[PDB]
Design a protein around this ligand. Sequence first.
Ligand SMILES: [Cl-]
Length: 224
Amino acid sequence: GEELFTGVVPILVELDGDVNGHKFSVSGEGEGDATYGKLTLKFICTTGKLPVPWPTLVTTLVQCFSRYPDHMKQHDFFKSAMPEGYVQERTIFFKDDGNYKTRAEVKFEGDTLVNRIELKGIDFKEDGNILGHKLEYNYISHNVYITADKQKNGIKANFKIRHNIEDGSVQLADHYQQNTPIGDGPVLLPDNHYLSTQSALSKDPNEKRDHMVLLEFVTAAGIT
Ligand SMILES: [Cl-]
């Protein structure tokens, strides 16, 4: 699996979403360079206006592009599952608001690394921070704490994302994650460690569709 990531890899993302019955679709394209932990992607809402804030979809919208230190390469579950891939499931609990439940398959289709996602959101407040679009277009959170899930031949993670609200407050998004291989092949089950991620959000000044440009750098750490 490692060998599939030594160069620059094209990425395709497809998301189908339904949040309190507000249906939407997102497509994304770009590339990943795992040697540097570097992702460059542009996402488009193909159905018109996105009915939730873009920052709330960042974590849902390819941890196989993380840079694992040489000394930690035996802990890289995500690449080890390739090319057949993995299922990534989350529940994201927005404090004092609704929750997303996501199921994605991350796998190669030829030379392209594909992330295909279904997102279901329920129990949101129609005038809350999410459906009311009260979140700032920025990102402040960084670590994903990974542990092995031996019983499921995979991993789990939990981490908190804080999203800045327009009034200076923060909207917590508590993430619970589980990943399992798609194939029957072997995978690497890691010792406890984390991924340190930074995501920078911007706009394409020539793009009239609702969209998000993302530049991300991700490095594994915590074993030394
Ligand atoms: Cl937004």
